[PDB]
């Protein structure tokens, strides 16, 4: 009956392009319980307030977590032209969203570090003539089409990953380029929160 954020606290978090998504339905949540286990560096919201999101009822609540570095925090804004918002992660404009940047304290041993931060610097589909490039921009809430060709971690900064597309798919290539950022002393993460609406169930409520 209580919304279970446990998968977040155990194991190695993913990267920004292959972010982990938790969908909560029919449960009670304690957002303060979760945020107190971390060192919150940034907390912003759109079409709602940090206090409101923690005290309302919705049809579902969506939480995205991933390894992200603070240095790169400007790139997470939707007013960036950078690779992150173009090819990795874009939040919903139409629905109320929250973006939390936090740091894993040394006490939180259960969350293990990745070797480094990885992201897609570009994602493109080349046509059958191997010349004409159609950039693949991320839609809000959606994964990059290149998550299927990029490893769960970029092996080395500047790597290119590519796969041929079958004639049924119109042929050509799917090509992506990866970048890395050196790992910080404590793991830095990003959390994305989205809430959805429905007329039947508003069974995602704050625990009282």
């Amino acid at each position: 009956v209580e919304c279970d954020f446990s998968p977040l606290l155990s194991g190695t978090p993913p990267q920004v392009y292959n972010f982990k998504r938790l969908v909560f339905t029919n449960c009670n949540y304690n957002l303060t319980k979760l945020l107190s286990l971390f060192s919150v560096n940034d907390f912003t919201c759109s079409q709602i307030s940090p206090a409101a999101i923690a005290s309302n009822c919705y049809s579902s609540l969506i939480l995205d977590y991933f390894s992200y570095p603070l240095s790169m925090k400007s790139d997470l804004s939707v007013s960036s032209a950078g690779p992150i918002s173009q090819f990795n992660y874009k939040q919903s404009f139409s629905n109320p969203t929250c973006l939390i940047l936090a740091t894993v304290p040394h006490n939180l041993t259960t969350i293990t570090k990745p070797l480094k931060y990885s992201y897609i610097n570009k994602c493109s589909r080349f046509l059958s003539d191997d010349r004409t490039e159609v950039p693949q921009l991320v839609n809000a809430n959606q994964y990059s089409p290149c998550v299927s060709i990029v490893p769960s971690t970029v092996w080395e900064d500047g790597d290119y990953y590519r796969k041929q597309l079958s004639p049924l798919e119109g042929g050509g290539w799917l090509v992506a380029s990866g970048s890395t950022v050196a790992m910080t002393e404590q793991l830095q993460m990003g959390f994305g929160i989205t809430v959805q609406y429905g007329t039947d169930t508003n069974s995602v409520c704050p625990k009282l």
Partner: antibody, heavy 116, light 108 residues
Framework: EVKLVESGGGLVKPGGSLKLSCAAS????????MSWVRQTPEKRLEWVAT????????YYPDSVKGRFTISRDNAENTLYLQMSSLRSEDTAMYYC?????????WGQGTSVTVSS | DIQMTQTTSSLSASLGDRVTIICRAS??????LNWYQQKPDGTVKLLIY???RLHSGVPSRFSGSGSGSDYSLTISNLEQEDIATYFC?????????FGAGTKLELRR
């Protein structure tokens, strides 16, 4: 046409050393991560090592860490596996593999036997 | 380390049949699952990468489906050349680990 041709396999005594090679062709070798995978006579597959495209990073399982060294020569288009402190459990068919998000292409393998 | 469990080690089927090999991971591996075919002469090829993507040169009758820790490889309209051992492999974390494989036999 992607080609991977391993060589260097043989009989080696326990506690011994052996260096395997892999001749790559038909693709831009320096653009891909490369891996070694071995198959035991009981047909079980086990990953041995991966090296990044530029040679900067290397990764190994615990069963081989400290004993095996993967390396590459991007000018010569060849992958290497230096083995040392060999045990009889290392007896296997060793495959050169093109890596990435998956193991694309596999060589035909080279046989290694560790025995007195 | 993540354990890959291929629940059946040997499978028997007829030509034209639809075969489904199932792979279980000991953990959520976030679709980083690949399939390999090894023919009796030892030759290994990649069939499917990232759960459902078909490697080039591999016939459409090979397909993949799954999520989390439950994954499947399917061969439809079973042909003679499909006599092989099929391995799954997780590529989510290191070390990448393989299943013990599933041997496919044809009925006669």
């Amino acid at each position: 046409e992607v080609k991977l041709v391993e060589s260097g396999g043989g009989l080696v005594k326990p506690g011994g050393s052996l260096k395997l090679s892999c001749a790559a062709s038909g693709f831009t070798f320096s653009s891909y991560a490369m891996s070694w995978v071995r198959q035991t006579p009981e047909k079980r597959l086990e990953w041995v090592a991966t090296i990044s495209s530029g040679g900067t990073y290397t990764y190994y399982p615990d069963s081989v860490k400290g004993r095996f060294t993967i390396s590459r020569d991007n000018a010569e288009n060849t992958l290497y596996l230096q083995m040392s402190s060999l045990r009889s459990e290392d007896t296997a068919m060793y495959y050169c593999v093109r890596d990435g998000n998956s193991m694309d292409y596999w060589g035909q393998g080279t046989s290694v036997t560790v025995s007195s | 380390d993540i354990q890959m469990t291929q629940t059946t080690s040997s499978l028997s089927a007829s030509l034209g049949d639809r075969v489904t090999i199932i792979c279980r991971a000991s953990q959520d591996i976030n679709n980083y699952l690949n399939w390999y075919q090894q023919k009796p002469d030892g030759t290994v090829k990649l069939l499917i990468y990232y759960t459902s993507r078909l490697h080039s040169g591999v016939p459409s009758r090979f397909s993949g489906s799954g999520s989390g820790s439950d994954y499947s490889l399917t061969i439809s309209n079973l042909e003679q050349e499909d006599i092989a051992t099929y391995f799954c492999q997780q590529a989510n974390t290191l070390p990448p680990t393989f299943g013990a494989g599933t041997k496919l036999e044809l009925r006669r």
